[PDB]
Design a protein around this ligand. Structure first.
Ligand SMILES: [Mg+2]
Ligand SMILES: [Zn+2]
Ligand SMILES: [Zn+2]
Ligand SMILES: [Zn+2]
Lengths: 114, 307, 168, 164, 112, 214
């Protein structure tokens, strides 16, 4: 789904079809470089998504003092310290699932059990 | 009497509150139509022969509510399939002989996938919607679809005509997503069921609070909603009194309008005598049509120049 | 009476405990997700209903304890001014101040006011009012009280002009 | 005779392809001609719905999940039955069936709406039925010169009123 | 509440309520009058049940009846024992007399 | 089955509504005729399996004895259902010529769908005969049976003159009703007619009222 660029000239490649050999050949519209396509996938709309509650993590989230602190442990390092905080996505139907990030194992883990 | 009525109806407007639009702006919109609603809610009662049949209620809601492809579309991908009669995708291969037991077409495959749950919640099977997208063109779209019982419901379609594929096919994709109705009547939205009750005469000759099932909505139409089966055509009712006027008649219109205004001003600070409210309603309807009391509305009439 | 005061206290406390239990159930992702509305909306409904039951149960207990030579009880069941709601409000608890039904919104990022830790929905956090008038307030409750009152004033001062126009 | 040969060849293919081999090939073509002659009994190749039922039964056979439909259709579950069945949801397989019932339960719940519950007490008394089942609710309406309204409603019958 | 049957058994009045009530038990004319006003009342009941689907009792209306007959009682000092000097004929004609004597629209024609 | 059956049912209900319309306009129909069973109508007026033959069940009707008692002038009325989706000018021309030849004064027409204005322009031809058009979907539901609309009733010109000379009005201050109202097209009245209306009032139950067609 990514947008490849011509390695000779950093420009947006377009799909264009072979006339007889029946293969998608990503030909550069700037220069004459051409490349065959790995998959027949071209375009993808994705009218439904549910993604974005997790990321935005820096390696020193816990360096900020404003996050609360708890005593549930990380289930890799068993250290009782932790930093917990809710979703990073904000829609009107995002969940009250929680995200728990530790300093020792430096790992992200949740509290869902379905 | 009209002056006294006006002052009486004017007094409790100062004690008002501010879901469903209520309060002062709702009162202003009702009194000052404004061919515009902000709340297209309409109430529907079932056939009395179906008292408490939840499957019947959801069959009715599936019958009445409009949906699109986008209501059921999740996976909408595009493909280059060179062989017209053999799939490069290894999953779709049995469907070839399912539909194969009319060649001059582009080797470009558009492919759609839906939700099983969002398909049969409204009680439609994928066969007839494949039929529907087949029949809406029949000339340009060679259309292939799977069985219902497969793990992933798929649609395979191609453009048939005896370079220049991508943007045409993208626009045709956008068109079929945005336009093709499925069932129901458009300008009607999500519908939900309340378990209302109704005071009903007892067979032994008394009254009893008896439950029944109702339909509420977020869209407005009248010319089609009594047409569908299993519906009481009589006891239907809508807040949007202009449409009741237009479909039914002006007497029913003034009755509905009085009902609506009574509900709004009796939400709080009730009450007043019926005669004042009735006088107001009937004098603002007594011209053969609705008339808001504006600078332009009642004033542009055969009426004395000084008033 | 002091024993009635501590009954008010433990009533509010068990209300808070059930609130905490419901929040924990939400935080482990398993809930009903009540029909019609959204998950968060159902959560808001549950906490609002719980706190209102706490408030008026407290008011009922206070009123039934209150004596027969109590002069303001004499005033209210005598009629003219005040009410059961007034007595309970001024004597036992206030209940969560709010604007337009939702409790006090996330003004600053991630939290309500900058003085709590992040990401909380506790009755203190959003600011359900614990105390009565008589024992005093905390500044947070003071601030929320001002919020609700100011909302009342602004809606009155606009609705007066609008109702005058429509009446004329 | 295009359809009455094509569907017969289709059942020739979908019965020879089975792990259940046809040494009773005459029995299996008897099964096929019985299937086709009850299949036409809906339409006789004169109705457009003929191909739909064929697609249903054909893709149910070729579904896999399940393959056991071949075994049960060769060892029983007679073909004139399986025009009048229309049991496409009912068959091939049962895990998908219970998936469908769970889906239907979920949809039937989620189509239900808002049911705000109106906590009651016995403090006041109704006007219509005069019962102490007051669906009370409290809120402020007027200007600054007063406290709340003391809104009232009876839940036993529906009677709304107000206290002074 | 309302069924009276002057010759039948179950809904018969107690003749201790009327001095001229014992001897009239079985008269046809009085029975006919009672039956026709009974039918009048039941058709009125059907009409009211039509014109209000719910069954609400309390309604806004002109001049009260309960209090006015109450003060009639407490001014002319009714006792608990004496059968009244009334007649069924007097009652059933006087009600229709007052019925026509309510006069809101002075006029003579058919429409009025 | 697909929408063939609901098409049949809709035609059945439209037939029902038209029948009660002709009845309460005052033309002699047996009241039992309107509750004709759906399957009976299906067997009666379908050709082989699913096609109703709309051209043939159209029927004539006559004024009641009471209708002649009130008014001295209604000829017989005549109805029609074409099969064409839109309505052809020549088809309706044959229709109106048939009406003129059979000497009728009330045109009762039903269209499947829209009609060209070139047919609509000669619709008001041949006075004193009058022509009217309805849609099936407009008449799928009998409007009077909705409980919100009150009863409606027609007047004589004699009664109208009596009403005016009694209430001392002059013809204009009396409240109006639009010609394009649904109840107006239901009753088929024209300008100058007065409609009495009785609705179930909430302080007196029965209550007089009056409207003038304009
Ligand atoms: Mg003037
Ligand atoms: Zn390049
Ligand atoms: Zn760890
Ligand atoms: Zn009540």
């Amino acid at each position: 789904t990514t947008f490849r660029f011509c390695r000779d000239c950093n420009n947006m490649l377009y799909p264009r079809e072979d006339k007889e050999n029946n293969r998608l050949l990503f030909e550069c519209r700037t220069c004459s470089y051409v490349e065959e396509a790995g998959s027949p996938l071209v375009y993808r709309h994705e009218l439904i998504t549910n993604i974005g509650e997790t990321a935005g993590v820096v390696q020193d989230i816990g360096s900020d003092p404003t996050l609360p602190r708890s005593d549930r442990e990380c289930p890799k390092c068993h250290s009782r310290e932790n930093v917990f905080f809710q979703s990073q996505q904000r829609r009107k139907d995002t969940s009250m699932v929680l995200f728990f990030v530790c300093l020792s194992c430096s790992h992200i883990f949740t509290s869902d059990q379905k | 009497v009209g002056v006294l009525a006006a002052q009486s109806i004017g007094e409790p407007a100062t004690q008002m509150t501010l879901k469903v639009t209520s309060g002062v702006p709702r009162l202003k919109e009702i009194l000052n139509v404004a061919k515009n609603m902000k709340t297209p809610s309409l109430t529907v009662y079932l056939e009395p022969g179906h008292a408490a049949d939840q499957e019947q209620a959801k069959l009715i809601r599936s019958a009445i509510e409009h949906t699109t492809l986008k209501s059921v579309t999740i996976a909408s991908e595009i493909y280059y399939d060179p062989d017209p009669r053999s799939t490069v995708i290894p999953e779709d291969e049995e469907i070839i002989q399912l539909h194969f037991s009319f060649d001059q077409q582009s080797p470009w495959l558009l492919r759609l996938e839906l939700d099983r749950a969002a398909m049969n919640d409204k009680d439609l099977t994928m066969g007839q919607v494949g039929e529907r997208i087949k029949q809406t063109f029949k000339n340009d779209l060679f259309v292939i679809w799977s069985e219902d019982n497969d793990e992933k419901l798929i649609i395979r379609c191609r453009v048939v005509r005896p370079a220049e594929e991508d943007h045409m096919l993208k626009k045709i994709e956008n068109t079929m997503l945005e336009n093709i109705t499925l069932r129901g009547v458009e300008n009607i939205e999500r519908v939900v069921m309340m378990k209302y009750d109704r005071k009903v005469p007892s067979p032994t000759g008394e009254y009893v609070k008896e439950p029944e099932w109702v339909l509420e909505t977020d869209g407005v139409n009248l010319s089609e909603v009594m047409t569908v089966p299993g519906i009481d055509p009589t006891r239907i009712y809508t807040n949007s009194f202009i449409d009741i006027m237009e479909v039914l008649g002006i007497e029913a219109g003034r009755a509905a309008l009085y009902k609506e205004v009574y509900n709004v001003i009796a939400s709080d600070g009730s009450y007043v005598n019926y005669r004042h409210m009735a006088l107001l309603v009937d004098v603002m309807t007594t011209q053969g049509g609705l008339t808001s009391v504006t600078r332009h509305g009642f004033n542009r009439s055969n009426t004395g120049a000084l008033m | 009476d002091g024993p009635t005061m501590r009954e008010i206290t433990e009533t509010i406390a068990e209300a808070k405990k059930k609130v905490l239990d419901v929040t924990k159930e939400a935080q482990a992702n398993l809930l009903t997700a009540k029909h019609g509305m959204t998950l968060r909306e159902s959560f808001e409904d549950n906490v609002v209903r719980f706190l209102n039951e706490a408030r008026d149960k407290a008011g009922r207990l206070a009123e039934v304890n209150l004596k027969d030579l109590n002069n303001v009880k004499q005033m209210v069941m005598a009629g003219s001014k005040g009410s059961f709601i007034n007595i309970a409000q001024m004597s036992a608890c206030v209940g969560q101040q709010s604007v337009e039904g939702k409790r006090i919104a996330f003004g600053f990022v991630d939290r309500t006011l900058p003085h709590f830790s992040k990401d909380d929905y506790s009755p203190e956090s959003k600011g359900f009012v614990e105390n009565s008038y008589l024992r005093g307030l905390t500044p947070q409750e003071f601030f929320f009280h001002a919020m609700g009152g100011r909302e009342g004033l602004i809606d009155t001062a606009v609705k007066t002009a609008e109702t005058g126009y429509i009446q004329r | 005779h295009k359809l009455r040969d094509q569907v017969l060849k289709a059942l020739y293919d979908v019965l020879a392809k089975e792990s259940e081999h046809p040494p009773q090939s005459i029995l299996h073509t008897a099964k096929a001609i019985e299937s086709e002659m009850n299949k036409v009994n809906n339409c006789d190749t004169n109705e457009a719905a003929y191909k739909a039922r064929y697609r249903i039964i054909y893709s149910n056979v070729i579904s896999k999940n399940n393959p056991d439909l071949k075994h049960k259709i060769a060892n029983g579950d007679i073909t004139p039955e399986f025009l009048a069945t229309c049991d496409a949801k009912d068959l091939a397989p049962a895990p998908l069936k219970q998936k469908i019932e769970e889906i239907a339960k979920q949809n039937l719940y989620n189509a239900q709406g808002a049911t705000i519950e109106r906590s009651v007490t016995d403090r006041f008394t109704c006007g219509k039925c005069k019962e102490k089942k007051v669906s009370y609710y409290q809120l402020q309406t007027r200007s600054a010169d007063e406290p709340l309204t003391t809104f009232c409603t009876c839940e036993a019958c529906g009677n709304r009123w107000k206290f002074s | 509440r309302y069924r009276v049957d002057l010759l039948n058994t179950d809904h018969t009045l107690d003749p201790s309520l009327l001095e001229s009530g014992s001897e009239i038990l079985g008269d046809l004319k009085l029975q006919v009058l009672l039956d026709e006003e009974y039918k009048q009342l039941v058709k009125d009941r059907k009409f009211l049940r039509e014109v209000f689907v719910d069954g609400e009792a309390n309604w806004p209306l002109p001049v009260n009846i309960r209090r006015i007959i109450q003060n009639a009682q407490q001014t002319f000092h009714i006792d608990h024992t004496k059968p009244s000097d009334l007649t069924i004929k007097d009652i059933v004609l006087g009600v229709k007399d007052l019925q026509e004597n309510l006069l809101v629209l002075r006029g003579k024609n058919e429409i009025i | 089955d697909q929408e063939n059956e609901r098409n049949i049912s809709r035609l059945w209900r439209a037939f029902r509504t038209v029948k009660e319309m002709v009845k309460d306009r005052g033309y002699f129909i047996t009241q039992e005729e309107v509750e004709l069973p759906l399957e009976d109508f299906k067997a009666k007026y379908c050709d082989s399996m699913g096609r109703p033959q709309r051209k043939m069940m159209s029927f004539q009707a006559n004024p009641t004895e009471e209708s002649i008692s009130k008014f001295p002038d209604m000829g017989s009325l005549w109805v029609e259902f074409c099969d064409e989706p839109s309505v052809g000018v020549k088809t309706m021309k044959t229709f109106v010529i048939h009406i003129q030849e059979k000497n009728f004064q009330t045109g009762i027409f039903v269209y499947q769908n829209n009609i060209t204005p070139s047919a609509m322009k000669l619709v008001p031809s041949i006075p004193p005969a009058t022509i009217e058009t309805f849609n099936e979907a407009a008449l799928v539901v009998n409007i009077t049976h909705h409980e919100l609309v009150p009863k409606h009733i027609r007047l004589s010109s004699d009664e109208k003159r009596e009403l005016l000379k009694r209430y001392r009005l002059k013809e204009s201050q009396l409240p109006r009703i639009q010609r394009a109202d649904p109840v107006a097209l239901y009753l088929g009245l024209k300008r100058g007619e007065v409609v009495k209306i009785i609705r179930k009032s909430e302080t007196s139950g029965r209550y007089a009222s009056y409207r003038i067609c304009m």
